[PDB]
Amino acid sequence: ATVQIRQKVPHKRTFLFLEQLILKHNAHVDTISISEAKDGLDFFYAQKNHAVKMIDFLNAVVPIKHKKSEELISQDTHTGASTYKFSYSVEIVPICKDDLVVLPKKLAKSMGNISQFVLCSKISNTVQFMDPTTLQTADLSPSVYWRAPFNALADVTQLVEFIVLDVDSTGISRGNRVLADITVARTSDLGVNDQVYYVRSHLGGICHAGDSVMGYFIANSNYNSDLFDGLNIDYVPDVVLVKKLY
Amino acid sequence: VNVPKTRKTYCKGKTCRKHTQHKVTQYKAGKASLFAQGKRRYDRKQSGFGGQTKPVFHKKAKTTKKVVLRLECVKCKTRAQLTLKRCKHFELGGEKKQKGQA
Amino acid sequence: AKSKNHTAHNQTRKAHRNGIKKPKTYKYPSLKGVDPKFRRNHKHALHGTAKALAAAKK
Amino acid sequence: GKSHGYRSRTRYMFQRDFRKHGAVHLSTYLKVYKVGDIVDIKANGSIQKGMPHKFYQGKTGVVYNVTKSSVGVIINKMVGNRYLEKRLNLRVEHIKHSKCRQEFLERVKANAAKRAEAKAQGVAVQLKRQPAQPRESRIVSTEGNVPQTLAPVPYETFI
RNA sequence: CACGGACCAAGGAGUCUAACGUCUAUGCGAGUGUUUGGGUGUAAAACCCAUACGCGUAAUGAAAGUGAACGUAGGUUGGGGCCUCGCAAGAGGUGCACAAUCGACCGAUCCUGAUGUCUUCGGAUGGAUUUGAGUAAGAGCAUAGCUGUUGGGACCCGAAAG
RNA sequence: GUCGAAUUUGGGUAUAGGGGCGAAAGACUAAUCGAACCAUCUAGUAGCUGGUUCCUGCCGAAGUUUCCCUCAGGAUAGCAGAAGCUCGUAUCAGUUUUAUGAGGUAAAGCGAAUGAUUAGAGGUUCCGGGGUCGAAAUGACCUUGACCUAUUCUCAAACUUUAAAUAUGUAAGAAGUCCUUGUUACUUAAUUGAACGUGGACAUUUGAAUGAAGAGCUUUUAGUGGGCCAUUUUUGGUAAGCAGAACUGGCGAUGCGGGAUGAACCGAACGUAGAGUUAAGGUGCCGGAAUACACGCUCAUCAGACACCACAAAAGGUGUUAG
RNA sequence: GCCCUGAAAAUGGAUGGCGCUCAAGCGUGUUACCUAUACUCUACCGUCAGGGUUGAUAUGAUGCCCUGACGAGUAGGCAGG
RNA sequence: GUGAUUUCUGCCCAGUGCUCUGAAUGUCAAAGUGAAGAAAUUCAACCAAGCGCGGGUAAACGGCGGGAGUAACUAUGACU
RNA sequence: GAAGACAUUGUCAGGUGGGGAGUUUGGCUGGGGCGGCACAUCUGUUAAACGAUAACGCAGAUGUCCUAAGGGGGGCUCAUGGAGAACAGAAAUCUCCAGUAGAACAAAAGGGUAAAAGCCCCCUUGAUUUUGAUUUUCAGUGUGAAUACAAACCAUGAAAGUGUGGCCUAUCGAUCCUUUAGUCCCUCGGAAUUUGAGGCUAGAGGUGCCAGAAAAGUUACCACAGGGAUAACUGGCUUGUGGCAGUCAAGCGUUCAUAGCGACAUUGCUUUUUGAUUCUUCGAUGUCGGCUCUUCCUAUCAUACCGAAGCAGAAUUCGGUAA
RNA sequence: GGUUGCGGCCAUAUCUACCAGAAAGCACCGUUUCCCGUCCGAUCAACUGUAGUUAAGCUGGUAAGAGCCUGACCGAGUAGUGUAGUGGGUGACCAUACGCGAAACUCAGGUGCUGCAAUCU
């Protein structure tokens, strides 16, 4: 038997989050050996039943799609007996924890009429999105994602260093001190230039003056998605603040 | 990448035929602009019973566009185009590089 | 059903049924590819020497 | 996946030499190539521009075109059941003369010399070459020379 | 130790047409093709004929358009045959077909822009590593045949379906 | 099994095909039902299976390249035929020699560079790389560790100074060499060079060997595009009548003599006949042919007998013979 | 070196069979002999190439005649019947 | 839907569905209206149901797990 | 009586709509699925010393990055080791000597390079225009990348010269459709003007199945053309593994290598295991076990006759002939 | 024959250690106004051939030196290898016939050669 775990991204956050958590709950106890692959890794299981126990564990912690197949080996004629060799192909949802995602138009209208230009927040059993301009969350169960897949707009490797000038909070707060209008300037343009950007962001309370934050920088990026092309350009912000550094 | 806003290159506009100063901006596609020939044929053919009659492209793999620059001469205003390779980050003008810094 | 993908057996014997031969290299080779600074003069050298043989020697 | 690049399988063929690294010597540039000369091709590893493909290493062609830095060389390459006539543009570092042709041009001058000299005498031009002949009969000398007797040796190990 | 065949007579499978390509035969030849039709008749035959039409005699460009001799219709290198001397061997002249090659002219693209001129029309002359399915003392049209192609039920027999 | 009821049954009448009817089985609807029957559209389409009708004569293949929703199929180059055309010593050739190139495998080397393997203990901002939780950073927790901190052997498809054998490129003249001076818008300080030429000189040994059932060009089309085996070099594999490549010969497409028998091995390739001599193998008898000659070895209460080939090992023997 | 032990498979059987023991076994040398659609010579058919022959006496000048070489073949092509 | 009677039928309304005396301008077709234009046209406002937000609903489809501990000779765990 | 310009009916428009219709549901592959990309490419190796050369063979990379990390010129020498200098140590800065590249050159690996192709300065846009020839994969078509020129215009340097992107080898795309730039030229065909539309020329918007379709499942109710080109059963080859037998004899048998147990190493046999393979059969060889019945094998549990013992008897244990 | 300028072939020319060099040429060397460049006239710039030197550079020699280059009845006709056999061997692999034929090592010898222009007891 074999559970084959796969994730298509070059940098796999949830997949490495899986290996740290597979050791905490003491899950892989019934392995024979562990092989690895280009896209993920493989687990070899002696009996049939120990493989299904892992998939019930994987369903709780990471959004997967799985299916099964088999191979015949012996076909003994003296009794009806199997000697079958099973294979479970498991694939993680290919969006990482903190990417930039542009949703499809019909899908974004059903999840509470969120805007299409959202982040990812909390990546869980289910996939959770966040609108960084106005705080509003929307969940995405894996059965809705695999009936119509889509790709991340930008990875973690596109983050750009920013330097914050001050924080102007609007006093709205769901759970993260919503909509602090951060006046932010580029790390690379602070030295010799006078160029200042102006953006609402969910990083409300944790940010002060002179702090280094990372962010997606839309103003120079030529994306080639048809979803991003089917937008209204003058409603797209220049800066999406992602995370505070250090 | 990063290109300067001003580039001195060869112009061909029947009076210059020499390296003159050009301005650099970024090429924009333009409006779809119906009453074109293919659009009037498409709206006639879709009309009626039969549903979708043209292929609709789905399986897209690329992630970048090539970058096109419209070089505009400052004397004769004879615009000319020039292409670049595929790149993810394209800004023009700022961020001049200095190699020795802290 | 797998297949034998590739071999070069019998490929040499097929070529030697017709006897591998030269392109037999004619006189006056074609001046395509010659430096066009040379061809522009070499036109006038032949046009000049045809004038000398016509008028003087008769 | 397979590999069929422009310089594949050229690990040892484009290496420079042992104790001959560095810049090339200046008699490479000073030699003169006229149209029709027989040349040989040996690709230099250091000069990357104008470089012959890995097939033409060691072949021999005729110069038809002379330009600023390079020469035009024709090479007969077989493909299928047919010779083709393919043309290259090699910079002068990669090219060199063929001494087989250069010995031919001085044998013609000797052949013209022997014909003109034998006409002054009047008979027996004798100009073609002949291969190695079986030798003539002769008499060896045992004077101060006794034929030494040999015998096969027995077997020893000394290992 | 794969499938069809118990035995006998009879039937039983690359055909026809439209439009064609190479090749061969015949007529005629800068022309060619009588036969939709008319005239006639010993009556679906044979014979005789006008005017148009078809392909050919000029290509090129998307088009508006423009349209093939500096010359013995060019120079070179071979070239069957022929002509002259010579006993022959060979020597020289002339070389069609044809093969390789440098030019010439016509059209497109790019440049030069003359005498002129409703002042913006006109494009003389000369070029250019470009380009054409071109010109350079025409070779095509019509019929018939083998072979080959495509559409036709298309060598013959055969579905589960619609 | 049931047998006085949700019972059995006659006649009448109603519902008809993507419809009816169903106390539900995808059951029944005239021996037809996970969609009836009849006729037409129809000779439906098939890259798939079977068949394809007279004789002799000459020539005679392919399972390979590139591209394709392509891998049981086509185009395309290859091999093959036919029609021939210009010419007839043309200079070509699956070859050698003289001369001169190129290469990095066999073998060599490790006291010439480069060099693995099996294992792996510590040192808490000399880093964090991959996470994770955080009203933040003097901020926490988990982990691979960052670090090998001390020496210790190994040789080599992916290590190298030198470097074979076989195979491989070019040259051996007339389209050449030499004097001489013509051409130009190129080139040179320069009638210097370059390139192509006039006129003159060098011919039968004209520039090594051997061969040349003529040399050269062109049009057009059939079949094929499932291969297989053997010696040698090899890769995956415990090994295979296994899988995948290299040069060459075969079988397929092919009989005949020999290996009793055999698609490939050994001889040898074919019109019909007579005579002679042989190959591969054989000569006690079946069986054509010496129970021939000569020198030795072996006796087995499972002897041994001829390549590919239908087998046999390590370890023992005062069995015999030579050392 | 030969032989022997090592050496065990299921229908009855295989140096090819009988059989063979100073071999009709193994090693080796010398001769003789047997025979293939192969090789040499000849006859004949056929194809291909190079030739001769309209004074005439032909009635087949797509005829008659001289010399030489070669002949396997599925798929396929052409040709004569 | 379930399948005599006796005896019971626990917890979850969020996911998917269904539904309402609920909020109002996020989405938003044709016809209409306005502006620009020589005119075909372009542009902008307005904008029904539905969707979106909010509530209800398990004898509707269904679901009912993870991490500690906290003892009485020898232990599951009431609790968190 | 009720209802009343609302309902109803007609046309267009948006929502809902497996209730119903039509079609689709890639390829390679040691069966098919799952995986994987071996499907478009690059370096080393396999590869057997020119080139070519396969496998789901091995060690790996690419769908990027750069106004400098492009172009030109000048100046200079690195990794590391040794010896010295307050705080200063294993590591700061400074100095000298030695230093063939042991460094660096955006990245995979392999080449290449020392008054440079590395490091630091100075100036610049040749990373430009016009189109042809040529190399690589090759059908001598495309596409990508690359070389050498010509005609223009410039950059740099005192100058010779060098530069048509990255030191070289990978870093990417047809038809139709839309769109911008060019000459601001051609056409809208009864003749004009102006909007609009269509053309020539050169780019971009993309087909990763990368010479380029627009596409989810299930069948245990199943159907047809076929395949031994291909699975599940017997047979054949192979023997890692299994059974089994030799040799070598560690530990044991209270003190004794072999009476007798015997692991581990090493050489073999068998087809009574399990694997590997695809040769025969898919126009069918009826595919488990039991009951019934014959015969064969010996690797002997019993029986017959013997040998050895740590065999006194009794009871055993080990070995031979023998089915 | 010695120098210098410019090279050609690129270790027989380099490397390490000591010694010798008349003549002239080189080279060290003296100064900072100017052109010019640096933290520093050290490097490069300019200025004088003047104050002075062969101490270095440079050239030549010596070393049973390290390296490098030629050879040889050195190793060795050995390793490998092309063809052939109904050759041996259960095999692994090995002999023969016609052929090509190395490398390390060992010893012996060598330690730059030359083109153009100028100038020197």
From Swiss-Prot, chain A:
GO terms for cellular component: cytoplasm; cytosol; nucleoplasm; nucleus. It is found in: Cytoplasm; Nucleus, Nucleoplasm. GO terms for molecular function: large ribosomal subunit rRNA binding; protein-macromolecule adaptor activity; ribosomal large subunit binding. Keywords: Cytoplasm, Nucleus, Protein transport, Transport. It comes from the Eukaryota. GO terms for biological process: protein transport; ribosomal large subunit export from nucleus. Its main location: cytoplasm. Acts as an adapter for the XPO1/CRM1-mediated export of the 60S ribosomal subunit. Unlikely to play a significant role in nonsense-mediated mRNA decay (NMD). Belongs to the NMD3 family. Associates with the 60S ribosomal subunit. Present with 11900 molecules/cell in log phase SD medium. This is 60S ribosomal export protein NMD3. It comes from Saccharomyces cerevisiae (strain ATCC 204508 / S288c) (Baker's yeast). The lineage of its organism: Eukaryota, Fungi, Dikarya, Ascomycota, Saccharomycotina. The chain holds residues 157 to 402 of 518 of the full protein.
Swiss-Prot record, chain B:
GO terms for molecular function: structural constituent of ribosome. The modification N6-methyllysine is found at K39, K54. One of its GO terms (cellular component) is cytosol. Keywords: Antibiotic resistance, Cycloheximide resistance, Cytoplasm, Methylation, Ribonucleoprotein, Ribosomal protein. It is found in: Cytoplasm. In wild-type cells, 78% of L42 is monomethylated at both Lys-39 and Lys-54, and 22% are a mixture of species with either residue monomethylated. GO terms for biological process: cytoplasmic translation; response to antibiotic; response to cycloheximide. Coiled coil: none annotated. It comes from the Eukaryota. SUPFAM superfamilies: Zn-binding ribosomal proteins (SSF57829). Component of the large ribosomal subunit (LSU). Mature yeast ribosomes consist of a small (40S) and a large (60S) subunit. The 40S small subunit contains 1 molecule of ribosomal RNA (18S rRNA) and 33 different proteins (encoded by 57 genes). The large 60S subunit contains 3 rRNA molecules (25S, 5.8S and 5S rRNA) and 46 different proteins (encoded by 81 genes). Present with 13600 molecules/cell in log phase SD medium. There are 2 genes for eL42 in yeast. Belongs to the eukaryotic ribosomal protein eL42 family. This is Large ribosomal subunit protein eL42A. The lineage of its organism: Eukaryota, Fungi, Dikarya, Ascomycota, Saccharomycotina.
From Swiss-Prot, chain C:
This is Large ribosomal subunit protein eL29. GO terms for biological process: cytoplasmic translation. Present with 51100 molecules/cell in log phase SD medium. Component of the large ribosomal subunit (LSU). Mature yeast ribosomes consist of a small (40S) and a large (60S) subunit. The 40S small subunit contains 1 molecule of ribosomal RNA (18S rRNA) and 33 different proteins (encoded by 57 genes). The large 60S subunit contains 3 rRNA molecules (25S, 5.8S and 5S rRNA) and 46 different proteins (encoded by 81 genes). Component of the ribosome, a large ribonucleoprotein complex responsible for the synthesis of proteins in the cell. The small ribosomal subunit (SSU) binds messenger RNAs (mRNAs) and translates the encoded message by selecting cognate aminoacyl-transfer RNA (tRNA) molecules. The large subunit (LSU) contains the ribosomal catalytic site termed the peptidyl transferase center (PTC), which catalyzes the formation of peptide bonds, thereby polymerizing the amino acids delivered by tRNAs into a polypeptide chain. Pfam families: Ribosomal_L29e (PF01779). Keywords: Cytoplasm, Isopeptide bond, Ribonucleoprotein, Ribosomal protein, Ubl conjugation. Belongs to the eukaryotic ribosomal protein eL29 family. There is a cross-link at K51 (Glycyl lysine isopeptide (Lys-Gly) (interchain with G-Cter in ubiquitin)). One of its GO terms (cellular component) is cytoplasm. It is found in: Cytoplasm. It comes from Saccharomyces cerevisiae (strain ATCC 204508 / S288c).
Swiss-Prot record, chain D:
InterPro entries: Ribosomal_eL21, Ribosomal_eL21_CS, Ribosomal_eL21_sf, Translation_prot_SH3-like_sf. Signal peptide: none annotated. There is a cross-link at K31 (Glycyl lysine isopeptide (Lys-Gly) (interchain with G-Cter in ubiquitin)). Keywords: Cytoplasm, Isopeptide bond, Ribonucleoprotein, Ribosomal protein, Ubl conjugation. It comes from the Eukaryota. GO terms for biological process: cytoplasmic translation. GO terms for molecular function: structural constituent of ribosome. The keyword Ribonucleoprotein applies. It is found in: Cytoplasm. One of its GO terms (cellular component) is cytosolic large ribosomal subunit. Pfam families: Ribosomal_L21e. Component of the ribosome, a large ribonucleoprotein complex responsible for the synthesis of proteins in the cell. The small ribosomal subunit (SSU) binds messenger RNAs (mRNAs) and translates the encoded message by selecting cognate aminoacyl-transfer RNA (tRNA) molecules. The large subunit (LSU) contains the ribosomal catalytic site termed the peptidyl transferase center (PTC), which catalyzes the formation of peptide bonds, thereby polymerizing the amino acids delivered by tRNAs into a polypeptide chain. Belongs to the eukaryotic ribosomal protein eL21 family. There are 2 genes for eL21 in yeast. This is Large ribosomal subunit protein eL21A. It comes from Saccharomyces cerevisiae (strain ATCC 204508 / S288c).
